[PDB]
Amino acid sequence: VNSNIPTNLRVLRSILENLRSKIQKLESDVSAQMEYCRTPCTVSCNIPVVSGKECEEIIRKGGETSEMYLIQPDSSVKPYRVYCDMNTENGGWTVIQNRQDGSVDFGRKWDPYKQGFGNVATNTDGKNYCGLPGEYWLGNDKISQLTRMGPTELLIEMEDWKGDKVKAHYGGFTVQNEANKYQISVNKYRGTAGNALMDGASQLMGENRTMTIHNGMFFSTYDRDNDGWLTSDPRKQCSKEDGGGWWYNRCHAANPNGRYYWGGQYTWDMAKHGTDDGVVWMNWKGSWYSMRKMSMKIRPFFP
């Protein structure tokens, strides 16, 4: 009788050996990726002759195509590179943030989010100009200074791994300066993705919903806590857990700068911290779904 299923629960050998094999794999991959990263990717973005204060102005000066341009929002600002969308709904869109292939790490510290990071654009096959956008984050200061030039609207777009897409429009958009921790301010919503920014996740109720509201929040990076998650525990901070820099409350309804989970569908036992740190927009696909495309564009409103 005794020792009924002993060598039965010896399946731990099979399990462990395998994992021991799964590990030999990962170590291999990191080595190669370590080697491949001996020579950096390169682009050659010849600069379009026409320039402006921002994308909108440029399109009014003949900038018909969507590509990287050079804009100088203000005489005091050093002209900088940015990707202009001159096709989506009237063009003149200045891309602020963009996700499409997970080629860029969005979980960076405070300074990289302030300065901005990523690839503004890459070359389109043959052509000598960079007509495709890259994954990037313009920079909290450039962004702020932009929304602060005058009435600015914000168009957020996302696409799932099924081909479908939805948008979130905010007739009013405003990011304050660093001194004001880039406090986001949005209004005049309309669209097909939920109003996650101003209302919070529809899935949620009570104060649960309201604490996932982003409007009015401060900008947080994992090395800079500014989320509305009041706790002394250094481990319990939104940014650290949910992915990267963003206007976290406690914590989110939308997380444009999260982790680029492939296939969209992901789970907690996959998530580094068991939270929904993907590129989420709960209001449209729950929290366990990382979009395939996610972008943020801005443009002067009208007044």
């Binding site: 649960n208 919903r209 996932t212 914590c251 989110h252 709960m282």
Partner: peptide, 5 residues
Amino acid sequence: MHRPY
């Protein structure tokens, strides 16, 4: 995502 009180 939220964090319950």
